[PDB]
Subunit: 159 residues, 6 copies
């Protein structure tokens, strides 16, 4: 008779921005799988494999508010100096060696995973704008077998 | 020869309740994303956006044991007085301003995030009962860009 | 020479039940699309549009074991009080307003998305039984443009 | 004017291997549903139901590099001793009893979910090799109604 | 001009072992939820509910180094004498009564949470070995509503 | 009637810096797990295993204020002279021997855990800058089994 208990838990994930563009609910998080890459194939100093395609959906956009648009990516360096390529996940005893995922900016040139690296001339129109980006496999030298997992955060700037 | 080492770790999350309703294993924790909300859109004193939908699954329920059912939500106030709306996560230098997520009770009226606020006439039947709830964006005045993340805990009462 | 790597992943989805009815492998998950609904068309307090048709296939059924059969649906309320209608997906900044999908029980009367709402006199025969159900668009008042996506879980009771 | 916000998130899932075989992007994760199994049907000590079929696609394969090929599966034991059969998901209050999914190796004999159980003579050819495997329902005694969900990880060895 | 400040913090969690088996980075910590258990259901002296399934991934394994393998679990006793069952978390005013989680060894028989209780004949093969284990709800008598949370540490022995 | 008691406790963790970069709330503390490392694998004088990837998020950054950026790490020496590698946690009777975690600077060369070792040419842009860093396993000679846990503090300099 009269029993108070905790049902479950609800995670309210959200983020406030400007009146220029807003990422979709199911667009916030996207799963992009590169696949299994062979070491022999990526055993060259500066080797590049097929580039995966993916774009972040962003509905609710205006043109009078913001005309210009910038893009950036948040990640880690594959081999320190090579900040253009992403690094392994966190498997010190199960990851790969000199193997990562490079990020190409829609601007035309390859971007570097720095976070605040906003160097793109994206056009913002009235509707559901979308930011395209590529991500291929990049080797710093001798690719090794193991784990080639990682993560990146998308960035948008309204001007 | 003969090496004893610690494999890994196992988190045993559980909770004992009454013989009226029991939350499902994969129903215990649910990820609900509101998305990116524009300040200009939520720049009104008492502004409300689209309300997200979500229900907590609860299998194993009886009718002779408990007929009535109460529901409540655990969270924080957006602007103190507005305890009906949830508050920001914890980013003092990256969160939003006057922006939160309101909780609507299935009873019909809007509920306030107080925890012990059990004001709902939910009918408990024999089977897998479920508690519906909505959660839209609520502005206390001038919405600001940044972070609009938060969390809430579900509550159930058997009578 | 001798390289051990992780091929892929296999998700084994299953569920044990009684010897009365068993859902088919390809019948477990069904994709039902309502389509694009106009606000002006659903801008009435308690408006209803065309009802979609769909039935869950369930082979392997007995008659001596269970003669009676109950049915229920798991979902969320469109406007709290209106628990009979489903709610939006989770797009706080891209969903609709006062727009949802109602569920009609094969029993004749409209059922409410509560989960444990088993109120149907379904006849269980020897063979491949199937549970019919309808789902039309329901407006609580002034329909709004955006997203009208949601999900529901089917429920069966053997007696 | 000039507003920097976080767009979304991108999950870069990958894995480096040898120059013998590489799993396809859409082949990495496969959804295999067994369906609803009746207790009465699996209420025998060592009962087996229909076996589901599924094979992991693996393009980019060589023959001069690796001629032999091994296969293994990662999972849990249904009843401890019965490590050959998979166990329930994690629903302590919603799962089944003595009900699981057995794994059959393409080698001919049934394999046990141990992870490092590589006991198969798979032939590696030049092209897109594929590893076949079956998975039927296995009862340790008296099957119970509830949840029969689980997961397994595929394993490949190049020699 | 020239400002030195502390960025953040990095927790380097690791553990050195033998050349027989090594737990994966993301396998080190695993989240296993039992769910909500009803008192009436666990109100019997020595009552047992559904057993959850879970296995600790351990890549990098050899066969010539270690052939035999032992397993153990670290936890607390539910009711002192019943060291086979885990105890509550630490909520003296919010936990349950006579309610815990039992641990079943893959060896076939049920193991007791003692830590150094290595009584299993696990076979170590070349590749990614995995240790299966079950964990159901165990009542010492009259189950009570509240909190049924706890934790356990995995243990492995190479011989 | 009228009872004054202490509810709980709230830890207010914060840090004031310059107008060049500010670490995120959930970015302040990051959990990086290396995993289980085999002694035989790290039984070489100056052995290095897979390097883990991780970057500290830092939103709110300016370009006119600070253009150059320095980075440093705070930790202990694995074997005194080897200040480039981190040392064990504090388990004098449960830690490892000659086993630690090296830190690689994004500048390209490997950095030493000294704290005030700011030797990196990081570019500061307008937005959410991020500092990448790697951390692999480093052996001073004969690796031993036990504990390989440690901690490091991130450092940033604005110029």
């Amino acid at each position: 008779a009269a029993t108070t208990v905790n049902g479950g838990t609800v995670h309210f994930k959200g983020e406030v921005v400007n009146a220029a563009c807003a990422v979709d609910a199911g667009s916030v998080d996207q799963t992009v799988q590169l696949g299994q890459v062979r070491t022999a194939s990526l055993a060259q100093e500066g080797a590049t494999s097929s580039a995966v395609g993916f774009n972040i959906q962003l509905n609710d956009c205006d043109t009078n508010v913001a005309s210009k648009a910038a893009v950036a990516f948040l990640g880690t360096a594959i081999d320190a100096g090579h900040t253009n390529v992403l690094a392994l996940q966190s498997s010190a005893a199960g990851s790969a060696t000199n193997v990562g995922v490079q990020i190409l900016d829609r601007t035309g040139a390859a971007l570097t995973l720095d976070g605040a690296t906003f160097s793109s001339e994206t056009t913002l129109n009235n509707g559901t704008n979308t930011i395209p980006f590529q991500a291929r496999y990049f080797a710093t030298g001798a690719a090794t077998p193991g784990a080639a997992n990682a993560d990146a955060t998308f960035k948008v700037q309204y001007q």
